[PDB]
Design a protein around this ligand. Structure first.
Ligand SMILES: Nc1nc2c(ncn2[C@@H]2O[C@H](COP(=O)(O)OP(=O)(O)NP(=O)(O)O)[C@@H](O)[C@H]2O)c(=O)[nH]1
Ligand SMILES: [Mg+2]
Lengths: 103, 608, 176, 49, 297
C-alpha cells in the first residue's frame, strides 16, 4: 500500500521538490549580477563526491586497514547511478562531474 | 487665479519630496540609534557637559558667557561645522517642505475643492497620501531623540565662529519645541481643513468596506476565479471604479485613522465616518509609518482623546475595537491567506495554459498581487510586534510569494499581447465613446477643450502596427493632462463642474488604466507587489526560509526568496544616494546564502 | 445586488430544463437526474443591474439528506410542479412547501406551473385519462398559491419560453 | 549511424556561478536643491507662470 | 495505442457524463464524494478497466521506463570507458597549483611527462600510412560518443506524440473560444475518472493497483497528458484534487457508500505527488493566440 512511507521515498520526494525549485529559474539578475543556482549544486556535488570517495576507502594508518577495491567500485557505481537519476530532474551535465572527480 | 494654482504639479512634486525626506530621517535615526555610527561628538564624555547645558534650554541661545561649562567645545568648532552640515540641512529641508504643504492645504481650503475617490481618484489619492506623508514625517522626527543636541550644538559653534546664529535656525527650534506630541498639535492645526479632508474620507465608504471582506465572502462570490463561469472568461473584466480595485488596503487604513484623528470633530456628528473609523481600528492593531517604524493606534488615540471634554464614548469604542482586533484579526488574515494561496495557484495555471487571457483578465492579476502583498506586509509587521499569546506564524507563505513571482514573470514575458489588446481597445471603443461624450456637452472652455481634443487624437493615432515593431510609447502627457483637468474642474466657480459629470470621470479613469497597462507594465508591477520591506526584516526573512527548507512540501517554492531579493533596489530614492550601496550589497549576500543553503540541503539528500 | 434562488419540486417537473432555457436558450429532451448544480445569469430588472445565482436541488427521495445544504442564506424560493402531473401538485400541499417553511420561515415563495405547452395536448390529456388523472387548470393554482401564501402564481413552458422571463423577473421583484 | 537516427543534441552549457558587469555602479554624491515647480511644464499641456 | 487502447477510451468516453461541474465548497467534502460516485457510476461498475486497459497502460509505461533506464546505463558505461582513454588523448586533469608557480608552466611540464603515452604523433613520426589512418579513425570513434551532448529520450517522446492522431484524444474545438471547462470530451477528464476509481480503498481479499501494475500505469497516463498539452488543465480540473482541497478546508470524516473519506484523501495526495513528479520529469525532458477586444455596436 502507498500509506506506508519508507526513508527512500521520503528522501526521493524531498529531493525532487528541491530540484524543481532550483530548475524553475535558469538565471536571475540582482543589482546587475547574474546568478546561476544550478552551478551551486554542481560545485557542492563535486566536493561531496570527492570527499565521500576518499572517506569510504576507510583508511586508518594506526591499524593499517583499507577497504577492498571491489566494494569501493560497487559503492562508486551506486553513487554514479544516483547522480544520473538526479540528471533526470535538473539540466546539469553529470558526465563532466565524473570526469573531473575521477581524473 | 484658479487656473494658475497648479495643484497637480505641486501635489506630485511634494509627494516625491516627502518620500525622500522620510528616507533621510529614517537613515538619520538608524545611524544614531546604535553607538557605533552616531557622531563622535555625542559619545565623548568630555563634551557631555555642553550637551546637557544645551538640552536644558534648546531654543534659547547664550554664548557671551561661557560659565566654565562649555570651554571644551571651543577648541573643536570647525570640525563640528564640517561634519554636522548634512543633518542640519536635512532638517532645514523638512521645514521648507512643512511650509510648502501648509501653503498648499490653505490654497485647497479657500478654493473649496470637490473630493471623491470614485470621481477624481488621482486628486484625492495624492491629497490623502501627501497628508499622511506629512504626518508620518513629523511623528518620525518626534522620535529621533537627539534632534535638539545636533541643532543646538551646530548653531552654537556657528555663533562662536561667526558671531551670528543661522538665519533659519529660530523657526526650526520653535517647531521642535512645539512638536512634542505632534498629533495633539496637528488636530488643532487641521480644524480649518476638516471639511475637505472629511469629505474625501467619507468618499471611501463606497470602496473600503467592500474591500475588507472575510474569506467566506470571497469563497461565496468566487473572487478571482476564471473557471467559475466558462462562457464569459473571454469577456474583458472591467468596472467603473477600476483604479480602486487594486488599491493598497493598508493605505486606506492609514488614511482613515489619521484623517479622522485630525478631523475628530466630525466623528460625533456623522455616523458613516464613525463606523468606517471603527472598521479600520478592528482591521489592524499596529500601522507602518515607514519601513520598520510602527505606530500603535489604541494607546495613542486614548491618550489624545482623554483630555477632550466629552469624548468618553470614543475612548470606550477604542477599547472594544482593540479587544475585537486582538481576538479576531489574526484568524481573519489567516483565512484570507489560505484562500489567496489557492486563488493565485489557479490563476497562474490558467494563464500559463492560455497566455492570451492576460490582456482581458489583467485586472484580476493585479488585484491578486495587491491582496497577496497586503497580507504579507500585515503578517510581517504584526508578527515581530504585539506580543499577546503560535498564531502569527505561517509556514505556507512560500507558495504565495512563488505564485506572485510567477504572475510577474507572465506579465513580463507576455507584455506584447496585452499591448496589442489594449491599443485596439483604445483606438476602437474608448475613442468613439469619449468623442460622442465630449460632443454631447453643454459648453467647455478653451483650456478644458484643448485637453479633451488632444486625448481623443492621441488614442486614434495609436495602431497595432507600432507594437510588433518594438515602438515604445509615452502616455505620461495624457495622465498629467487628465490630472490637471481634474484639478481645474474640481474647484468651485467652475464652468464645467466634475460633480455633474461623474460618468465622464469614471470613463477617463478606465482609459488612464488602459494607458498605464499599455506603457507602464513595470511601474504597475512594482507598485502592486512591492516586497522590498524584507530587506529591513532579515530575521523573519531568514526564519521563513529555514522553515520552508525544513518542510519538504514547501521546498518547491524556496526559489521565491532569492527572487524577492531583486526587489530590494525598488525602495531607493534619488534623494538619499548614500543608502543605495548598503542595500545593494545586502541583496547580493542573501541571494548567495539562499542558493548555498539549497545546494547544501540537496547534497545532504544525495548522500542519504 | 446579488439574489440567491433555489428551485425545489418533485422529480421530472422540468426544473433544470427551465434554468437551462433561461441561461443558454436551449432545450434538452433527455432526463439526467441532478444531486445538485449551480447556474448564474446577469439581468437588468427595474433599472437596477442584478446578478442572479440559481441553485438546482433533486426531486428524488434518496437525495433528501443532501438537499438542506442548498437552503441556508437564501432570498427567494421557487417551487415547480408539472401541470400534467396531479401527484406533484399535491406534494406542494404536504411535502415541498412544509419543508421550505421549517428551514427558512420568513422567506418569500414563488409557485411556478411547468409544461404549459403539454397542458392543452389532448394526446397528453388522453393517456393521463387512462390513469384516471386530469390536468391542472389556472384557477386551481390560484387557490393553492393563496393557501401556501406564496407572493405570486405563474405558468411556464421551456420549449416555447412563453413565461420563462417573468418567473425570474417577478422573483427578483418579490425580494425587491 | 543506426543509434544516431534516434538521437538529438543537448542544450547544455556552462556559465560561472557569479557574473559581474564590466562597469560597476559607483555611488553618486548628494547635492541639496530647493523645491522647483517648473519641471513638469515641458511634458503635456503645461502652464508657464 | 492505436488499437485496443483507442477502442477502450472510445467506449469509456461514451459512458462519461457529458457535462461535469466541480461542486462549490458549500456542499462540503462528504456531499462532494456522493456527487462523484453518482456521476461516474458507469466507470466504477466497469470491470475490464482494471484487467485490460490498466494492463495495456502498464505495458507502454514500463517500456518508456526501460528506454529511460537503458539510456542512463549506456551513458554511465560510456563515460567510464572515456575516462580510461584520457592518457592517450592528452586529456589531463586540473593539477594543484600553489604560491610560487603558475599554471602554464606546471601544465606544460605535465604534458611533456606524458608525451610518450600519446599515440597519434608517435605513429605519425614512424609507422606505415595504413597504421596512421587506422589509428586516426580509431581515435575519432573513441573520442566522439553519445554522452557528449547527445540524447534520444526526446525523440522517443516525439514519436509517441505522432502516434496519437485520432481526434478523440483532444476532442472538438471549445464553444467559449478558449478552453473546455465543464465538458468531458478530453482524455485528461477520463484519467481523472480513472484516478477516482483506483483511489478507492479495496478490500482485504483483493489487491491494489500498486501491487499489480506499479508506477507504469501512472507514467503512461502522465505521458499521454503531457504530449497532448493538457497537463495544466488536468491539475486545474481534477475530481480527486477538488475533493482533497475541500476535505482540508473543512476536515470532516464519514463513510459514504462504504468508502471511507479520510483514507481516500491521503491516497489522493500520494498519487498527486507521484503525478507531479512524473509530469515535472516529462516536461523537463520536453524543454500565441491573441483575442480581439469588444467593438462598439
Ligand atoms: N415537452 C416538454 N418536456 C419538458 C419540459 N420541461 C421539461 N421537460 C422534460 O421533462 C423531463 C424532466 O425534466 P427535468 O428538468 O430533467 O426535471 P428536474 O425536476 O429538473 N430533474 P430532477 O429530478 O433531477 O430534479 C425531461 O425529459 C425534460 O426534457 C417542457 O416544458 N416541455
Ligand atoms: Mg435537474
Amino acid at each position: 500500500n502507498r500509506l506506508v512511507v519508507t526513508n527512500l521515498d521520503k528522501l526521493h520526494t524531498a529531493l525532487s521538490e528541491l530540484c524543481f525549485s532550483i530548475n524553475y529559474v535558469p538565471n536571475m539578475v540582482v543589482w546587475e549580477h547574474t546568478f546561476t543556482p544550478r552551478e551551486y549544486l554542481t560545485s557542492h556535488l563535486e566536493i561531496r563526491f570527492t570527499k565521500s570517495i576518499v572517506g569510504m576507502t576507510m583508511y586508518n594508518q594506526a591499524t593499517q586497514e583499507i577497504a577492498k577495491p571491489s566494494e569501493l567500485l560497487t559503492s562508486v557505481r551506486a553513487y554514479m547511478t544516483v547522480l544520473q537519476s538526479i540528471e533526470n530532474y535538473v539540466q546539469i551535465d553529470i558526465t563532466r562531474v565524473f570526469n573531473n572527480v575521477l581524473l | 487665479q484658479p487656473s494658475q494654482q497648479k495643484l497637480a504639479e505641486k501635489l506630485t512634486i511634494l509627494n516625491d519630496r516627502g518620500v525622500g525626506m522620510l528616507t533621510r530621517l529614517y537613515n538619520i535615526k538608524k545611524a544614531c540609534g546604535d553607538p557605533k555610527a552616531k557622531p563622535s561628538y555625542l559619545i565623548d564624555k568630555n563634551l557631555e557637559s555642553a550637551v546637557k547645558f544645551i538640552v536644558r534650554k534648546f531654543p534659547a541661545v547664550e554664548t557671551r558667557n561661557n560659565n566654565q561649562q562649555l570651554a571644551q567645545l571651543q577648541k573643536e568648532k570647525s570640525e563640528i561645522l564640517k561634519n554636522l552640515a548634512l543633518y542640519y540641512f536635512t532638517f532645514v529641508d523638512v521645514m521648507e517642505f512643512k511650509d510648502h504643504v501648509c501653503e498648499l492645504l490653505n490654497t485647497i481650503d479657500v478654493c473649496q475643492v470637490f473630493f471623491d475617490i470614485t470621481v477624481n481618484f488621482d486628486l484625492t489619492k495624492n491629497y490623502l497620501d501627501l497628508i499622511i506623508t506629512y504626518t508620518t514625517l513629523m511623528i518620525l522626527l518626534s522620535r529621533i531623540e537627539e534632534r535638539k543636541a545636533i541643532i543646538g550644538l551646530y548653531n552654537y559653534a556657528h555663533e562662536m565662529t561667526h558671531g551670528a546664529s543661522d538665519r533659519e535656525y529660530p523657526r526650526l527650534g520653535q517647531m521642535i519645541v512645539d512638536y512634542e506630541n505632534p498629533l495633539k498639535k496637528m488636530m488643532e492645526e487641521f480644524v480649518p481643513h476638516s471639511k475637505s479632508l472629511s469629505d474625501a474620507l467619507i468618499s471611501l465608504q463606497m470602496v473600503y468596506p467592500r474591500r475588507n471582506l472575510s474569506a467566506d465572502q470571497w469563497r461565496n462570490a468566487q473572487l478571482l476565479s476564471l473557471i467559475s463561469a466558462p462562457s464569459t472568461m473571454l469577456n474583458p473584466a472591467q468596472s467603473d471604479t477600476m483604479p480602486c480595485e487594486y488599491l493598497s488596503l493598508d493605505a486606506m487604513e492609514k488614511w482613515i485613522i489619521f484623517g479622522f484623528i485630525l478631523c475628530h470633530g466630525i466623528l460625533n456628528t456623522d455616523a458613516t465616518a464613525l463606523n468606517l473609523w471603527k472598521l479600520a481600528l478592528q482591521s489592524s492593531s499596529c500601522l507602518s509609518l515607514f519601513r520598520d517604524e510602527v505606530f500603535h493606534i489604541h494607546k495613542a488615540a486614548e491618550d489624545l482623546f482623554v483630555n477632550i471634554r466629552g469624548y468618553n464614548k470614543r475612548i470606550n469604542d477604542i477599547r472594544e475595537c482593540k479587544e475585537a482586533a486582538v481576538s479576531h484579526a489574526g484568524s481573519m488574515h489567516r483565512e484570507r491567506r489560505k484562500f489567496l494561496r489557492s486563488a493565485l495557484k489557479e490563476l497562474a495555471t490558467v494563464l500559463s495554459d492560455q497566455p492570451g487571457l492576460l490582456g482581458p483578465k489583467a485586472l484580476f492579476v493585479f488585484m491578486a498581487l495587491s491582496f497577496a502583498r497586503d497580507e504579507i506586509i500585515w503578517l510581517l509587521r504584526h508578527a515581530d510586534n504585539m506580543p499577546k499569546k503560535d498564531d502569527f506564524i505561517d509556514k505556507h507563505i512560500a507558495e504565495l510569494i512563488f505564485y506572485m513571482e510567477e504572475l510577474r514573470a507572465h506579465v513580463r514575458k507576455y507584455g506584447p499581447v496585452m499591448q496589442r489588446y489594449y491599443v485596439q481597445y483604445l483606438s476602437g471603443f474608448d475613442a468613439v465613446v469619449l468623442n460622442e461624450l465630449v460632443q454631447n456637452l453643454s459648453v467647455c472652455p478653451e483650456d478644458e477643450s484643448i485637453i479633451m481634443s488632444s486625448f481623443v487624437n492621441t488614442m486614434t493615432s495609436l495602431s497595432v502596427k507600432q507594437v510588433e515593431d518594438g515602438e515604445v510609447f509615452d502616455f505620461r502627457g495624457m495622465r498629467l493632462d487628465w490630472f490637471r483637468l481634474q484639478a481645474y474642474t474640481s474647484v468651485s466657480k467652475a464652468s464645467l463642474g466634475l460633480a455633474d459629470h461623474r460618468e465622464l470621470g469614471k470613463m477617463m479613469n478606465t482609459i488612464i488604466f488602459h494607458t498605464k497597462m499599455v506603457d507602464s507594465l513595470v511601474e504597475m508591477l512594482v507598485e502592486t507587489s512591492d516586497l522590498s520591506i524584507f530587506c529591513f526584516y532579515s530575521r523573519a526573512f531568514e526564519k521563513m526560509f529555514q522553515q520552508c527548507l525544513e518542510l519538504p512540501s514547501q521546498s518547491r517554492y524556496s526559489i521565491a526568496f532569492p527572487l524577492l531579493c531583486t526587489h530590494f533596489m525598488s525602495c531607493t530614492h534619488e534623494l538619499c544616494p548614500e543608502e543605495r550601496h548598503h542595500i545593494g550589497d545586502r541583496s547580493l549576500s542573501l541571494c548567495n546564502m539562499f542558493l548555498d543553503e539549497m545546494a547544501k540541503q540537496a547534497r545532504n539528500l544525495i548522500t542519504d | 445586488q446579488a439574489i440567491k434562488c433555489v428551485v425545489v419540486g418533485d422529480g421530472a417537473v422540468g426544473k433544470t430544463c427551465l434554468l437551462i432555457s433561461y441561461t443558454t436558450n436551449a432545450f434538452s429532451g433527455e432526463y439526467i437526474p441532478t444531486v445538485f448544480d449551480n447556474y448564474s445569469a446577469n439581468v437588468m430588472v427595474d433599472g437596477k443591474p442584478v446578478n442572479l445565482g440559481l441553485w438546482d436541488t433533486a426531486g428524488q427521495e434518496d437525495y433528501d439528506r443532501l438537499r438542506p445544504l442548498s437552503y441556508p442564506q437564501t432570498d427567494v424560493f421557487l417551487i415547480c410542479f408539472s401541470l400534467v402531473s396531479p401527484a406533484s401538485f399535491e406534494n406542494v400541499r404536504a411535502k415541498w412547501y412544509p419543508e421550505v417553511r421549517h428551514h427558512c420561515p420568513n422567506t418569500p415563495i414563488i409557485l411556478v406551473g411547468t409544461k404549459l405547452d403539454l397542458r392543452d395536448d389532448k394526446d397528453t390529456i388522453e393517456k393521463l385519462k387512462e390513469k384516471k388523472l386530469t390536468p391542472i387548470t389556472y384557477p386551481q393554482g390560484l387557490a393553492m398559491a393563496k393557501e401556501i401564501g406564496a407572493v405570486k402564481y405563474l405558468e411556464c413552458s421551456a420549449l416555447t419560453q412563453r413565461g420563462l422571463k417573468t418567473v425570474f423577473d417577478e422573483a427578483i421583484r418579490a425580494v425587491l | 549511424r543506426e543509434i544516431g537516427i534516434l538521437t538529438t543534441n543537448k542544450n547544455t552549457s556552462r556559465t560561472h556561478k557569479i557574473i559581474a558587469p564590466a562597469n560597476l555602479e559607483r555611488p553618486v554624491r548628494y547635492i541639496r536643491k530647493p523645491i522647483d515647480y517648473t519641471i513638469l511644464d515641458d511634458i503635456g499641456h503645461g502652464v508657464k507662470v | 495505442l492505436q488499437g485496443t487502447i483507442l477502442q477502450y477510451v472510445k467506449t469509456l468516453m461514451e459512458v462519461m457524463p457529458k457535462i461535469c461541474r466541480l461542486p462549490r465548497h458549500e456542499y462540503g467534502s462528504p456531499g462532494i464524494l456522493e456527487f462523484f460516485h453518482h456521476q461516474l457510476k458507469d466507470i466504477v461498475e466497469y470491470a475490464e478497466l482494471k484487467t485490460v486497459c490498466f494492463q495495456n497502460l502498464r505495458e507502454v509505461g514500463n517500456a518508456i521506463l526501460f528506454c529511460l533506464l537503458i539510456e542512463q546505463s549506456l551513458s554511465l558505461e560510456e563515460v567510464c570507458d572515456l575516462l580510461h582513454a584520457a592518457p592517450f588523448q592528452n586529456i589531463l586533469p586540473r593539477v594543484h597549483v600553489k604560491e610560487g608557480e603558475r599554471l602554464d608552466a606546471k601544465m606544460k611540464r605535465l604534458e611533456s611527462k606524458y608525451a610518450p603515452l600519446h599515440l597519434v604523433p608517435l605513429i605519425e613520426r614512424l609507422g606505415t600510412p595504413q597504421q596512421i589512418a587506422i589509428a586516426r579513425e580509431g581515435d575519432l570513434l573513441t573520442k566522439e560518443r553519445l554522452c557528449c551532448g547527445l540524447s534520444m529520450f526526446e525523440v522517443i517522446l516525439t514519436r509517441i506524440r505522432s502516434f496519437l492522431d485520432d481526434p478523440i484524444w483532444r476532442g472538438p474545438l471549445p464553444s467559449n473560444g478558449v478552453m473546455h471547462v465543464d465538458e468531458c470530451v478530453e482524455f485528461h477528464r477520463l484519467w481523472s475518472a480513472m484516478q477516482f476509481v483506483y483511489c478507492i480503498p479495496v478490500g482485504t481479499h483483493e489487491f491494489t493497483v500498486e501491487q499489480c501494475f506499479g508506477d507504469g500505469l501512472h507514467w503512461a497516463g502522465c505521458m499521454i497528458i503531457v504530449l497532448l498539452g493538457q497537463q495544466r488543465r488536468f491539475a486545474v480540473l481534477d475530481f480527486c484534487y477538488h475533493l482533497l482541497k475541500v476535505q482540508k478546508h473543512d476536515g470532516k470524516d464519514e463513510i459514504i457508500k462504504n468508502v471511507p473519506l479520510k483514507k481516500m484523501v491521503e491516497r489522493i495526495r500520494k498519487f498527486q505527488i507521484l503525478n507531479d513528479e512524473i509530469i515535472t520529469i516529462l516536461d523537463k525532458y520536453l524543454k500565441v493566440r491573441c483575442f480581439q477586444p469588444p467593438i462598439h455596436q
